[PDB]
Amino acid sequence: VLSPADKTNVKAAWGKVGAHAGEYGAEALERMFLSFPTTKTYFPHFDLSHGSAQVKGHGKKVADALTNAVAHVDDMPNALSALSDLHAHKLRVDPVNFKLLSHCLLVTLAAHLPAEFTPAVHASLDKFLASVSTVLTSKYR
């Protein structure tokens, strides 16, 4: 559960990400596939090589979902209802994988935001990604 300060921090940090959101989504996926190779079992069709168009494309979709979650932070079950159906009901993703991707998104933000990735921002983003992850791993409709 997010505090007012967390919501401010998330909106400010994601604002700093701005137009790079898609790039960062893609890099986070790449980091995840290299660090935690079992996650690749969810994307076997995909070309998972460095510079992959498929990873670039997927990364943009992930990023846009996160932007949507930020804009609807007080309405996440509703905003992410179709993504929850996909991840929790259809794909049955093991929740551990959300911890892995969330970590890799934090690493990616840390690597790109050396002037803005403060401890408080880190904290708020970690909570935000836990909240998103909880919605996407829940079947509630």
């Binding site: 890099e27 790449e30 980091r31 290299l34 660090s35 935690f36 460095h50 970590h103 890799c104 934090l106 690493v107 990616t108 840390a110 690597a111 790109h112 050396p114 990735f117 403060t118 401890p119 408080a120 880190h122 904290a123 970690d126």
Partner: protein
Amino acid sequence: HLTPEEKSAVTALWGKVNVDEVGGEALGRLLVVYPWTQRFFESFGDLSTPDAVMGNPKVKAHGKKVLGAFSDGLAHLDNLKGTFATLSELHCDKLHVDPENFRLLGNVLVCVLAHHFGKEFTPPVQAAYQKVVAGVANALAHKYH
């Protein structure tokens, strides 16, 4: 189980890691990001705000020891479990730290290396470090296994 190329990458980056500060940064961020961990550090004094934590001299001094332990693991990658035996007994048998918190601190450290090294902290360099921090956490949790 790091490739030779992964070993040189890990070694090269680590030689640039500031021993006085990176550990304190990782411990400090652990205390801020995962607030329940503060319960283990009542003797450290003021942890009331992020600024209090990150400026806290006991967090910095303790973090230097944590970082020294990671340095030890890096020098003994083929025997992390032996390297960490004494610390495993402290953390598991005496303090009863939940082992997930070992993984959390390892991941915080990776976030700290990323912050510091930026473009140098490439996905393949991360992957090598992830094997290291997984091995350290596993070794620290040995006494639960």
